Amino acid sequence: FRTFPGIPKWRKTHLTYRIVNYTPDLPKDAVDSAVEKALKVWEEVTPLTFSRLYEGEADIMISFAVREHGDFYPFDGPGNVLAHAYAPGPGINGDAHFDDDEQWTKDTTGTNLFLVAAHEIGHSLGLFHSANTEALMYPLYHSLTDLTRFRLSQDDINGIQSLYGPPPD
Ligand SMILES: [Ca+2]
Ligand SMILES: [Ca+2]
Ligand SMILES: [Ca+2]
Ligand SMILES: [Zn+2]
Ligand SMILES: [Zn+2]
């Protein structure tokens, strides 16, 4: 696993998220479930906990965007860059933007929202890319049809626990 230069990390264990907008690709509850499960992945192996906000500035603001969207990194149309997320910190840091030029799906027929979201939240929490091929934090989106088997790899658990430690009890 790779942590980020300077090892920026959250100095608190309780983090808020806000789903700022919704893609036309899916039912709103599918977007909610995907994001909720993505957080869970990481919540499960650390003392981090998450709560959702519906107004104000949450630590992790989540949105869908197309091309230019308010930061210096425009999205790029279909495929390639699927999303991006900023390392821990204030304001735009911690935030995650998903390219709506992708077709987000609950399954693997398009771009799986839960999988990319689990990866991006890894970034929002302090993990950079891993050199390990079976890690979620590996840069490589394969269209893993088999989400039925998903498990955070040990390398991901090692990286995230190196930042925040294991679960307390
Ligand atoms: Ca933020
Ligand atoms: Ca793209
Ligand atoms: Ca879309
Ligand atoms: Zn962005
Ligand atoms: Zn990444």
Ligand-binding site membership of 129 (annotated)? yes
Q: Distance, CA 120 to ligand 1 centroid (Å)? A: 13
Q: Which domain holds residue 86?
A: 1-169
Rounded distance between C-alpha atoms, residue 29 and residue 149, angstroms: 22
Domain CATH code at residue 159: 3.40.390.10
| CA dihedral of residues 124, 34, 32, 102 (deg, nearest 10) | 80
Rounded distance between C-alpha atoms, residue 164 and residue 125, angstroms: 9
User: Distance of CA 82 to CAs 43, 74, 114, 138, Å?
Assistant: 23, 11, 12, 14
Q: In terms of Cα–Cα distance, which of 12, 47, 50, 42 is closest to 156?
A: 42
Task: Name the experimental technique.
Answer: X-ray
Ligand-binding site membership of 14 (annotated)? no
Write the CB contacts of 158 (distance below 8 Å, at least 6 apart in sequence): 1
Task: Tell me phi and psi for residue 32, to 5 degrees.
Answer: -60, -45
Within its chain, how far is the Cα of 169 from the centroid? 25
What 3-state class would DSSP assign to 51? Answer: strand
Resolution reached, in Å? 1.9
Domain count, the chain: 1
Rounded distance between C-alpha atoms, residue 69 and residue 53, angstroms: 22
